[PDB]
């Protein structure tokens, strides 16, 4: 529990959690804090961090400042960023399509060395968007998420490989910075070492060495243990330092006039000058620990060097030659080995703050070029920063990261969990990582460095498998961006209560144990051969004295949407993937109901998401209405929480909050005061418990189809509200004004009855395809281009959102008015709608039956959903059988008869679990939960029904009656309660049909799509299949009269409407243009007959 209003949910867990679940959007708020340099991050870092904690803005400016000019006379510098309060609030920003931003100011000092004068001012840098406490940004009204990025950390990476032709094992080296050019090295198929300075032509390697001022005596003292490197030396026609720099400036700047000083200033101002080449602290640290450099030193100097460009070659050469051990001349010993590329000690996380840092850097570089352009063209001592500085570029960068990027996404809100997994997401795509050239099959796989850092299961089903993932629940992010997960320190075999947040590099050095490993007396293990992992994920049994660390909990390597799947160790992996990715796309229901059998990770996933409302301060409740709630705290301060009522999510779902408190209620802090769209009493309730019978019926549940009662339609059980948004703009046309009025061109006044004075539709009315919503007249004199209901849509007009220019609030270029109309539709479960459970069990609804012909129990209870037997064992998802059993055990309580002791199947049960009433709620954590002994004998107890009759035996089975015949099915059937989820895949959204309509006028076929009102692709394979039948007229028909022939489809429409024989092309028609143009080429053609 540990939460104030925590509804009790008993747990079968036999292990204790020495570490609570950390925050679940503390990976999107710590980074923004860092960026804006809030005081919270400042303290956190001063505790464990440097004594000069720099932020992300500070750092950018410090790298920018001081802006000196070629004459070193006048200098500009920035410092002290500072944010003033937000102009609006989240709700206001949404109501008005504004943006959630705070003004940013900066102190600019302007020094002149000539006169020693200063012109400091507090200049304005524009409005900066802000990260909402829910881990979001608000942009022109929409909630948006800046998803993290997985990218190759800066540093040196050596990769062996095989030559496509020679099939020869060769080697290589690649040096990649955070900013600047790359530097590669190779050992060729002919044993000649070489370099690829800025990915140009492969010239030799000693060329470089000389360009840095090395004499063959040095090249032969450092090297000389090798004989391919000497042989490379020997074949350098370009002997001579300056000849080498000429070679390089040539390969880089070919032909154009050279110079020696230019040569040194290029070889220097490309790698060694920390403005055109930078290894951020992470690249510097990687290089140092890799090559054996600068052990225990002040990393301050974050740029390349000349000693590392040599130790790199040396490493490479001792690699090609099979040497495992290296020692730089003055460094420390080191292992010689290849560097994996999917490993996460090499992959790193660009969080939102880093992305925005980089785009601000871009904007500032442009503002700096402008500063210079404008600094040496204006009288000195009369130029002030406010004259030198034009902020217009910077904002663009910002306005170009959110408005239009790939890592800034419309928020994925079908439900709280859909948005909470859109924030703990790890995307391997976007500018900076692999975009299209490396979407292969070895990066999309699982790697033993994923344990505790990235979920092996939760990854979408579409094209981004293995690219996009979700962060685990016990994982955080180093300041260097590498992901960390905690472990427990073993000292002699006795598990200490001390925590250590390790990363993959560190983890690979020890033996990490398992959470279920036993303990007897304050930690010591019971066994002798305990099971552990190792460097390469090499699971092994080992003596418990070899152990050095241990996992705090199971469910460490799983995500939120995957720690909410009970009995996961009983379900294979592809169907668990299905279960997660279907638990994301679950539509909220009118009245929500939380699972009887669930997991402990459903309270937090709702608190740590933000659709619930929690108390900021302890106190009592002063007023409770549907919309507002008013609290009087102990300090006397009065709080007021406004609730979202029937608001439209970005996916059509509803976003209605509702209170769960009574006036005069002494709430605590963090206590839930309102429930959201898919929560009940503060825990995720995405579906409903239904009475299920595992059995085949009269063919209507064939091949994963499934059956329903009409109860789920009478009582509005699986009903859901869906809202739609339609907008229309009254923008300029140069022929007058696009006017919104009611005096529409001549039409039935009966259409103009549900329209208010201004020609807009009246709230509360109901609509239907074609029905007018807002009458807009664009001038001609006047035409009719109004907003009418689309095809396959209807509903009640909830409300309206109008935006005029007579207020000058804001509207884009050339607009005078915008009207947004919202329409709502209550959608009931129906034949075709998709339905699922948390275990990958999914299907469509083939039959909806009256309750009088549903298999019922001896007590008269008709089951609510029938699922077939044949899909369970070949799909390997029996977790649903266990769920069914436990659902019964929980809807019907239990009392273990302990009169004669506790049965042997209960010797591991936590007391307080020896009894429970009806409609109870339990918890089976994914890898520490209900077993089969604890669940076999726990099915016998099963408190009787209101009549003393036990309707389910100790095997999980009842005796049903055919509601049609009347006789009992001759064998007992498996009955229970299952948690079932309704999904966004609905049939009112999929049924598409077409006879006629608009075409593409480019290819001159119908359009492709459903909103476009298009047709269906008849492809090549289909033409093959249509030929193998020997059907020629259908093919002709399809390829001429339907898509391309524009003079035939008309003849056809007319023929049909008139009822005459559908004609036939007397002579093929695609032939005539080609006939002309081959005749035009003086090639006689004669259509014969």
């Amino acid at each position: 529990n540990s939460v104030p209003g925590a509804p009790n949910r008993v747990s079968f867990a036999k292990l204790r959690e020495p570490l609570e679940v950390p925050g679940l959007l503390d990976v999107q708020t710590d980074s923004f804090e860092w960026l804006v340099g809030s005081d919270r991050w400042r303290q956190a870092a001063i505790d464990r961090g440097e004594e000069n904690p720099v932020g992300g803005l500070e750092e950018v400016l410090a790298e920018l400042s001081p802006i000196e000019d070629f004459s070193g006379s006048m200098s500009l510098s920035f410092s002290d960023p500072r944010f003033d309060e937000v102009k609006a609030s989240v709700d206001e920003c949404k109501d008005k399509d504004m943006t959630y931003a705070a003004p940013l100011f900066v102190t600019a000092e302007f020094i002149n060395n000539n006169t020693g004068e200063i012109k400091s001012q507090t200049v304005f840098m524009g409005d900066f968007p802000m990260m909402t406490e829910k881990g979001t940004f608000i942009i022109n009204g929409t909630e948006r998420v800046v998803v993290s990025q997985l990218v190759r950390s800066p540093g040196v990476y050596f990769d062996e490989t095989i030559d496509k032709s020679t099939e020869k094992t060769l080697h290589s080296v690649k040096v990649i910075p955070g900013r600047g050019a790359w530097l590669e090295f190779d050992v060729d198929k002919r044993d000649t070492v070489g370099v690829r300075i800025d990915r140009k032509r492969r010239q030799p390697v000693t060329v470089l060495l000389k360009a840095l001022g090395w004499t063959n005596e040095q090249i032969v003292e450092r090297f000389g243990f090798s004989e391919i490197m000497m042989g490379t030396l020997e074949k350098d026609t370009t002997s001579g330092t300056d000849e080498a720099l000429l070679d390089i400036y040539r390969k880089l700047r070919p032909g154009e006039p050279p110079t020696k000083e230019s040569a040194q200033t290029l070889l220097e101002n490309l790698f060694f000058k920390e403005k055109r080449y930078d290894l951020a602290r992470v690249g510097r640290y990687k290089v140092n620990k890799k090559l054996g450099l600068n052990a225990g030193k002040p990393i301050t100097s974050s740029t390349l060097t000349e000693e590392d460009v040599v130790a790199t070659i040396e490493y490479l050469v001792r690699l090609h030659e099979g040497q495992t051990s290296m020692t730089v001349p003055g460094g420390v010993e080191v292992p010689v080995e290849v560097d994996d590329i999917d490993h996460f000690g090499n992959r790193r996380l660009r969080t939102v703050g880093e992305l925005i840092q980089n785009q601000i850097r871009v904007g500032l570089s442009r503002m700096e070029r402008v500063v210079r352009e404008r600094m040496t063209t204006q009288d000195v001592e009369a130029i002030t920063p406010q004259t030198l500085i034009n902020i217009r570029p910077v904002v663009a960068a910002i306005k170009e990261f959110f408005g239009t990027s790939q890592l800034s996404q419309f928020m994925d809100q079908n439900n709280p969990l859909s948005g909470l997994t859109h924030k703990r997401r790890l995307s391997a795509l976007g500018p900076g990582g692999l975009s299209r050239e490396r979407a292969g099959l070895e990066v999309r796989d699982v790697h033993p460095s994923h344990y505790g850092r990235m979920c092996p299961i939760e990854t979408p089903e579409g094209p981004n498998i293995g690219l996009i993932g979700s962060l685990s629940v016990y994982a955080r992010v180093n300041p260097f961006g590498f992901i960390e997960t905690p472990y427990r320190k073993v000292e002699n075999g006795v598990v200490t209560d001390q925590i250590d947040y390790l990363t993959a590099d560190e983890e690979d050095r020890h033996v990490v144990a398992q959470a279920n490993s036993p303990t007897d007396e304050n930690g010591r293990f019971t066994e002798d051969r305990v099971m552990v992992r190792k460097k390469g994920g090499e699971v092994e049994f080992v003596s418990a004295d070899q152990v050095d660390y241990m996992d705090v909990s199971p469910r460490q390597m799983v995500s939120v949407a995957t720690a909410m799947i009970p009995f996961l160790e009983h379900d294979d992996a592809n169907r668990a993937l299905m279960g997660a990715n279907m638990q994301r796309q679950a539509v909220p229901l009118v009245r929500s109901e939380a699972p009887l059998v669930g997991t402990g990770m459903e309270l937090r996933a709702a608190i740590d998401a933000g659709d619930v409302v929690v108390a900021d301060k302890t106190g009592v409740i002063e007023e409770v209405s549907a919309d507002y709630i008013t609290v009087m705290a102990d300090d006397g301060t009065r709080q007021s929480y406004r609730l979202r009522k029937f608001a439209r999510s970005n996916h059509g779902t509803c976003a209605n909050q509702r209170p769960i408190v009574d006036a005069g209620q002494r709430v605590e802090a963090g206590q839930v005061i309102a429930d959201g769209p898919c929560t009940q009493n503060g825990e995720m309730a995405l579906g409903k418990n239904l009475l299920v019978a595992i059995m085949p019926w009269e063919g209507h549940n064939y091949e994963d189809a499934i059956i329903l009662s009409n109860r789920l339609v009478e009582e509005d059980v699986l009903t859901s509200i869906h809202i739609e948004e339609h907008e229309i703009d009254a923008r300029d046309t140069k022929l007058g004004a696009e006017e919104i009025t009611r005096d529409i061109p001549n039409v039935s006044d009966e259409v103009l009855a549900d329209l208010d004075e201004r020609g807009i539709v009246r709230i509360g009315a109901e609509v239907r395809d074609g029905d007018i919503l807002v009458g807009k007249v664009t001038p001609k004199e006047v035409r009719d281009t109004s907003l009418k209901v689309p095809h396959g849509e209807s509903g009640k007009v909830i409300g309206i959102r109008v935006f005029s220019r007579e207020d000058d609030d804001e509207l884009p270029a050339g607009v005078n008015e915008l009207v947004r109309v919202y329409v709502a539709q209550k959608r009931k479960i129906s034949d075709g709608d998709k339905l699922a459970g948390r275990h990958g069990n999914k299907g469509v609804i083939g039959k909806i039956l009256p309750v009088e012909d549903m298999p019922f129990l001896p007590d008269g209870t008709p089951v609510d959903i029938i699922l077939n037997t044949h899909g369970v064992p070949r799909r390997m998802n029996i977790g649903q059988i266990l769920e069914t059993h436990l659902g019964w055990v929980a809807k019907a309580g239990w009392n273990i008869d302990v009169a004669a002791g506790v049965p042997d199947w209960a010797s591991k049960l936590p007391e307080e679990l020896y009894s429970a009433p009806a409609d109870s709620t339990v918890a089976t954590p994914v890898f520490d939960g209900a077993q089969e002994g604890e669940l076999a004998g726990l099915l016998g107890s099963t408190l009787p029904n209101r009549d003393g009759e036990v309707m389910v035996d100790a095997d999980g089975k009842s005796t049903l009656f055919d509601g049609r015949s009347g006789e009992p099915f001759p064998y007992p059937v498996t009955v229970g309660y299952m948690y079932i989820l309704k999904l966004h895949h609905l049939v009112d959204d999929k049924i598409h049909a077409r006879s006629t309509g608009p075409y593409s006028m480019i290819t001159q076929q119908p359009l492709g799509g459903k909103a476009q009102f298009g047709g269906q692709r008849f492809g090549e394979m289909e033409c093959w299949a249509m030929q193998a039948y020997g059907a020629a007229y259908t093919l002709q028909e399809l390829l001429t009269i339907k898509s391309d022939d524009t003079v035939g489809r008309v003849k056809v429409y007319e023929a049909i409407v008139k009822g005459e024989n559908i004609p036939e092309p007397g002579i093929p028609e695609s032939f005539k243009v080609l006939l002309k143009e081959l005749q035009s080429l003086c090639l006689n053609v004669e259509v014969l007959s």
Binding site: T166, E167, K189, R190, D191, T192, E227, I228, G231
Partner: protein, 113 residues
């Protein structure tokens, strides 16, 4: 083998050379053009040269490619061939710039030639 023999720019990993005293300087040149890794297992004798080009000196053939790095070892004692035949062929060799370095043969317990 078939990939290599069908190619001339092929860098091998090791090169064994038996009766090495019969290769012209250009032969060694081509070889070292084959093996840059300079891993060689040269075997030979200088007093038993047939070709006139030959080497007459390892330093003449190697110091151009491996100067001061090339190791050299010479077996000293003779056991396989009697010392009678050895004196016969040692006083045969005692002509045409002999500078005779006869390895000392031992264990000759049979009929003289």
């Amino acid at each position: 083998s078939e990939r290599a023999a069908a190619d001339r720019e092929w860098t091998y990993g090791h090169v064994v050379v038996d009766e090495a005293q019969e290769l012209s300087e250009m032969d060694w040149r081509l070889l070292m053009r084959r093996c840059p890794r300079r891993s060689f297992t040269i075997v030979g004798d200088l007093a038993q040269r047939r070709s006139p080009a030959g080497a007459r000196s390892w330093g003449a053939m190697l110091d151009s490619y491996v100067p001061g790095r090339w190791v050299y070892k010479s077996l000293s004692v003779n056991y396989r061939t009697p010392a009678e035949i050895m004196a016969v062929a040692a006083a045969v060799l005692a002509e045409f710039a002999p500078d005779a370095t006869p390895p000392d043969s031992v264990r000759a317990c049979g009929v003289a030639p």
